[PDB]
Design a protein around this ligand. Structure first.
Ligand SMILES: Nc1ncnc2c1nc(Br)n2[C@@H]1O[C@H](COP(=O)(O)O)[C@@H](O)[C@H]1O
Length: 133
C-alpha cells in the first residue's frame, strides 16, 4: 500500500544461487552499491556492507545456509537471494524463511544483478519496504 519511513537495514546477507561465472563478485558489489544509493535517496537506507555474501547451488543448500545465518548474525534483518531464472530454490527460500525460521527474504533475478536499471532497483526497494515496514 503506502511507503514506510524509518526503515534502516543494518544487518543483511546475500545468498547468490546464480553461478559465480555468470554473476561475479563485481556484479554483486556493483548491484549492492546501486541498491545502497537508491535506498538511501528513498529514505530506507540499506548499509553498503552485507554481513555475509556467498555462492550456493540447489534447493538442498537453502535450509542449511539459512540455519547458519540465523545462528551466526545477531540482528539479521534480511537475506537478499539471487536466482538464475525460474528455479525450485525460490519456493524453498520461502518455505524456510516464511514458514520455518521466521526470516525476511527478498528474491531478485540474476539479470537485474548483472545489469541494474533505476526501475528494477526501485521495484526491489518497494518489495523490501513492504516486507520490513
Ligand atoms: N519460481 C521462481 N523462480 C525464480 N524466481 C522467481 C520465482 N518466482 C518468483 Br515470484 N521469482 C522471483 O522472485 C521475485 C520476488 O521475490 P520476493 O517474493 O522475495 O519478493 C520476483 O521478482 C521474481 O523475479
Amino acid at each position: 500500500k503506502q511507503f514506510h519511513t524509518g526503515i534502516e537495514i543494518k544487518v543483511w546477507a546475500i545468498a547468490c544461487f546464480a553461478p559465480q561465472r555468470q554473476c561475479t563478485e563485481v556484479h554483486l558489489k556493483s548491484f549492492t552499491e546501486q541498491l545502497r544509493k537508491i535506498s538511501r535517496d528513498a529514505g530506507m537506507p540499506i548499509q553498503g556492507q552485507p554481513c555475509f555474501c556467498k555462492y550456493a547451488q540447489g534447493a538442498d543448500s537453502v535450509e542449511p545456509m539459512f540455519r547458519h545465518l540465523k545462528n551466526t548474525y545477531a540482528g539479521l534483518q534480511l537475506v537478499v537471494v539471487i536466482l538464475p531464472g525460474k528455479t525450485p530454490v525460490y519456493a524453498e527460500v520461502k518455505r524456510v524463511g516464511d514458514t520455518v525460521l521466521g526470516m525476511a527474504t527478498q528474491c531478485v533475478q540474476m539479470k537485474n544483478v548483472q545489469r541494474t536499471t533505476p526501475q528494477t532497483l526501485s521495484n526491489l526497494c518497494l518489495k523490501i519496504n513492504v516486507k520490513l515496514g
